[PDB]
Symmetry: D2
Subunit: 264 residues, 4 copies
């Protein structure tokens, strides 16, 4: 009776289904897969990448950047929603091949430093190549690349360092406020009495109110289904997209029902 | 046509076949599995562990230490042959649960810090939970725990930081010189003209002569088959064990034949 | 006209004035200097150290532990108030010489990892030997060593990872609730409109209310003058010590007057 | 009798004496001070910096890069001779302000990671802001930026990770082989029987022969006096510069006389 073999982190095939660069605004592009968000922001002084999806998506992201006329040495910054294998996966390979820097808060940096290992809820079941954050960011801090200002909004819950990013782009000259809000889900998390996360419920509740008050005209999430984005239809992808109020309100209802069932 | 799924590092079942603590000398014990070496050294001032095998062997190692009367807080040091997933796997979990420190050289420390990712030959196919080395060790440096002196011998080749450890134990009062020599194999390595490792052949050749001159009465290797150890038979495990000369000479012949076929 | 020479972090002589182990409770001891707190907690399963003061105090701390019958290998844990050079100074040297582990939150860990460099308010003027945190701690998490439970209380302000620690000791069988609250001062900090710390005022205000509600019978601070401790008189050191209410209330008044003068 | 105050790392004023960009070859520039080398290499695809001198020289280096028409975001790589405070000082500040990556070997990376603390010979007397190496380099590995190939040559001795860099530039179309060899000095080092560095003498001797065989037409050293460079005279700076043979031969004679006096 030998010890069990290691089991690989397998996902649905749609998470690894590549797609062409879908345009979100004048400078914002979706360059990930159909069910995983990876936002590219093109400025005059370089490019910014938000999330990267699964670790094996590193080659696909560079091809889309090549399609948008972005050389690897033009990627200047990498911002993260939260440092899980399905979002910060290819960060390590992207740093070695692009010369880009990574900005994250202390909680995301320490989770990124150990490659998702020793997760508060998943243990070591979702490991990915570790990377190091080059700039430590605080709540409400502004990061500027090529004139576009990125304001950080801490929304702890899914991970201790879950961060939502807001920036103002344009759509035919008219300004649009984009809000890339992180996941508000707790899949299989022990909500009450968790010794690894004692104030988990208080952080989720504060994060619900944080997402409601985000300056947002167009909302995006790491998993596009959470905000009803459908990258497959391309032109009509943002048709049924939720607001920040509707996204946080629906997430809180599923959180309260989940908390009530945990006490049962 | 989606991107490929991640594939888990799977090994032969004998590598994960637990065994009772086999005695090597008065203070040296084999507490790993049948085909993976994990040496425990009991002193009066604490315990020292050499290697740990696969990551999922962390629970098995603590049970054997419990069988030998070693509490988790008595493990004081963790020494490594080389920082691969099948040898330094459970190092991260052991540090969190035992309060032990890890001593390794700079090359093993940087490979251990990124959890085996970005391997010079395997890329990211053999990732394990990352750990941090607490003490950086040089070639020929002595580490002393409870009166037993551990001398490091750098033997680069399999990994840039492959290290052999020598210490003198006893067997019924009579001293015996133990040499835990690292692997001298190059499974699928590009030996000549490797841009990631330009002086690979020069390091292997120097490591062959290094193993021959090791002060050794009893030889052990991370994979027990490399030195003809058979942990299954227990009492007669060291019956057909090789010398340091025979181990390095056989490894060099397989290396030269492999190098000659690579040029073909 | 050459560039300026580096300037060393110099303090008042009383901060470096060694003292004998002063007893705070049955198991709690002050083993630092006269104007710098370094708390030693002796249990049956090991010892815990809270803060260490200046970097050059590493030799003095081990001598006091020797006076209390604590060998270097008995120090099991190192807890921190905040990772500044005058409190977490000798942490790096203590880890190499004691085999102890360090527990801190993500913000204290990243500041400890870069040795106090790139401080949000002091830049690189207060660098100390860097150390690595072995266990990442969350708000309200309990750390247990030898039966004594240490509960963490995040109180950001002086540093982003300022932490207060509470544990219950005894004094002749009678239980006493000890609260080691971190500094609530902001010496020369830009409080309003700080780009490195946008929500600085909101964190201080929340930390003021956090200290008021600490379960505390006896209060201690990293700088003993902040809570009116006088380690010099020894037996009557805790005579005029402040409560948690009086400490947080006085710190908030000095904070409000400082904020009002910054707007002037 | 209080503990001693910290003492700052003070150097001669000429080490901090700024100078205008002196031209070494078509693409190689000296942009450091008069007695500290900091080499800038301008290519079409970016710029490469070799060493940076003292930590307080970060502002001076960016001004010279501005004089050469190099924006901060054009510095792509930072190479190091060895990670001491007087050579790798401003590496941490340069990474935060330029978006550049650092390439070094494992021994230089671990010394750079702890900011020069716990030095094998100087202890903690020469601490500088810590930085992290982004790419780990092996002996003989080639690093290419903008068409210029940088070959690494390990020459351990002054530090365990001392590295010499060779690249081929031009001087009016004619190619010139530049060799930036690291220091071969051992100021106050215990050469024989050093427990922190057992094979110190064997590494110096091997490094002496390594420098002799460097492909070199023009030699440069971190301290320009070691190779008889005089940056002050500008146009005639390379007048009396030594060869690789003369530099290694003179360093070995001073090493042998120093070793013979240590035995006395
Ligand atoms: C670690 O990645 C996740 N978990 C998994 O993929 C497996 C392990 C699973 O839980 O089934 C995780 O958390 N995500 C989220 C999110 O909302 O962020 C949701 C909803 C589920 O998918 C990813
Ligand atoms: C990464 O671990 C190893 N490789 C594998 O397990 C797979 C990936 C494989 O190569 O088939 C590796 O190297 N080892 C050694 C050794 O001699 O050290 C040998 C001989 C083969 O087993 C382990
Ligand atoms: C970095 O250490 C401190 N600052 C200094 O020592 C110098 C630089 C200084 O500010 O004069 C710092 O902050 N402390 C505190 C505290 O309350 O924690 C107070 C009140 C002042 O002393 C230490
Ligand atoms: C740490 O920096 C050095 N040492 C000092 O600056 C002080 C501490 C000193 O030794 O007097 C060091 O080593 N260098 C070298 C070199 O050859 O690299 C020489 C010759 C001396 O200067 C620098
Ligand atoms: Zn997730
Ligand atoms: Zn997810
Ligand atoms: Zn291996
Ligand atoms: Zn192996
Ligand atoms: Zn402070
Ligand atoms: Zn202080
Ligand atoms: Zn030096
Ligand atoms: Zn020097």
């Amino acid at each position: 009776a030998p010890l069990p073999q290691l089991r690989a982190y397998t996902v649905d095939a749609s998470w690894l289904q590549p797609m062409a660069p879908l345009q979100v605004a004048d400078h914002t592009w979706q360059i990930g897969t159909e069910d995983l968000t990876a936002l590219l922001v093109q400025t005059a002084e370089g490019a910014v990448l938000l999330d990267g999806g699964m670790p094996q998506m590193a080659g696909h992201l560079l091809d889309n950047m090549k399609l948008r006329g972005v050389a690897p040495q033009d990627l200047r910054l990498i911002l993260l929603s939260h440092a899980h294998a399905d979002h910060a996966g290819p960060v390590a390979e992207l740093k070695r091949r692009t010369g880009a820097h990574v900005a994250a808060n202390a909680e995301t940096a320490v989770l990124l430093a150990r490659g998702g290992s020793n997760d508060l809820h998943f243990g070591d079941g979702i490991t990915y190549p570790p990377a190091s954050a080059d700039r430590i960011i605080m709540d409400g801090e502004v990061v500027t690349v090529g004139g576009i200002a990125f304001t950080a909004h801490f929304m702890p819950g899914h991970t201790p360092g879950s961060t939502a990013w807001t920036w103002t782009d344009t759509r035919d000259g008219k300004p649009v406020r984009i809000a890339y809000a992180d996941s508000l889900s707790a899949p299989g998390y022990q909500l009450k009495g968790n010794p690894r996360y004692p104030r988990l419920i208080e952080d989720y509740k504060r994060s619900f109110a944080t997402v409601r008050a985000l300056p947002c005209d167009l909302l995006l999430t790491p998993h596009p289904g959470a905000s009803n984005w459908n990258y497959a239809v391309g032109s009509k992808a943002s048709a049924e997209a939720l607001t920040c109020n509707a996204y946080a309100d629906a997430a809180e209802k599923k959180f309260d029902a989940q908390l009530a069932r945990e006490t049962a």
